[PDB]
């Protein structure tokens, strides 16, 4: 038991939190998935020749008390902050998610990746540069993804893992 990585997926409702995690774990794209469902997913992967286990909480951000939600927030090593490129509101909402993570971790150095999802859609409302600058503002990687095509799906989770390794040394 050498390396396990605890990852948390956060972001506005309907940006593709669920779709992204399932696409990663089950290698399929989900049409519909209950927006109120918050669950943890485990899968063994090799990343850069190093076999490790990913332990990934897909957040739904409901109100009811969860002991598991709390555990992941406190012990979680890295966070995906997801918006959608066709959803200007979800992009504007990123800052709320960043600040909560800062508070939870009580630090400015928290492994994170900015992810722009639904990049397979022509109706973009959020420019590469827009997202690029925010991620630059935060000093974090920005990756464009599609849960429907798998574009960037591996790079999003793997980049985050790599961010976590840099935090280890
Ligand atoms: N075209 C497209 N649709 C997506 C993508 N990711 C998610 N969706 C769709 O967007 C909707 C919301 O996704 P969901 O995973 O439920 O979002 P969540 O609320 O953040 O968990 C669903 O109808 C998905 O099929 C994507 O990359 N491309
Ligand atoms: Mg969901």
Curated annotation (Swiss-Prot):
- The parts of the chain that form a coiled coil are none
Result of changing residue 62 to L: Promotes GTP binding
Which SMART domains does the entry link to? RAB, RAN, RAS, RHO
- Subunit architecture: Interacts with PHLPP. Interacts (active GTP-bound form preferentially) with RGS14. Interacts (when farnesylated) with PDE6D; this promotes dissociation from the cell membrane. Interacts with SOS1. Interacts (when farnesylated) with GPR31. Interacts with RAP1GDS1. Interacts (active GTP-bound form) with both SHOC2 and PP1c (all isoforms) to form a tertiary complex; SHOC2 and PP1c preferably bind M-Ras/MRAS, but they also bind K-Ras/KRAS, N-Ras/NRAS and H-Ras/HRAS. Interacts (GTP-bound form) with MAPKAP1/SIN1; inhibiting K-Ras/KRAS activity.
What happens upon changing residue 147 to V?
A: In OES; somatic mutation
Question: Its family?
Answer: Belongs to the small GTPase superfamily. Ras family.
Q: Which reaction does it catalyse?
A: GTP + H2O = GDP + phosphate + H(+)
The residues that the entry says bind GTP are: 11-19, 30-36, 60-61, 117-120
Q: Which positions does the record annotate as the modified residue N6-acetyllysine?
A: 105
Domain of life according to the entry: Eukaryota
Any one GO CC term of this protein is:
cytosol
Q: What is this protein called?
A: GTPase KRas
Quote any Pfam family the record assigns.
Ras
């Amino acid at each position: 038991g050498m390396t396990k990585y605890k990852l948390v997926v956060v972001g506005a409702d309907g940006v593709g939190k669920s779709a992204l995690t399932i696409q990663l774990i089950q290698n399929h794209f989900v049409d519909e998935y209950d927006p109120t469902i918050e669950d943890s997913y485990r899968k063994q992967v090799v990343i850069d020749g190093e076999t490790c286990l990913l332990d990934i909480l897909d957040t739904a951000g409901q109100e009811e008390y969860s002991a598991m939600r709390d555990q992941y927030m406190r012990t979680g090593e890295g966070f995906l902050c997801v918006f959608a490129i066709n959803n200007t509101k979800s992009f504007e909402d990123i800052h709320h998610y960043r600040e909560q993570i800062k508070r939870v971790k009580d630090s400015e150095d928290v492994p994170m990746v900015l992810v722009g999802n639904k990049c397979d859609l022509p109706s973009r409302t959020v420019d590469t540069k827009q997202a690029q600058d925010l991620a630059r503002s935060y000093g974090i990687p920005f990756i464009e993804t599609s849960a429907k095509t798998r574009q960037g799906v591996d790079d999003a989770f793997y980049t985050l893992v790599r961010e976590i390794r840099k935090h280890k040394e």
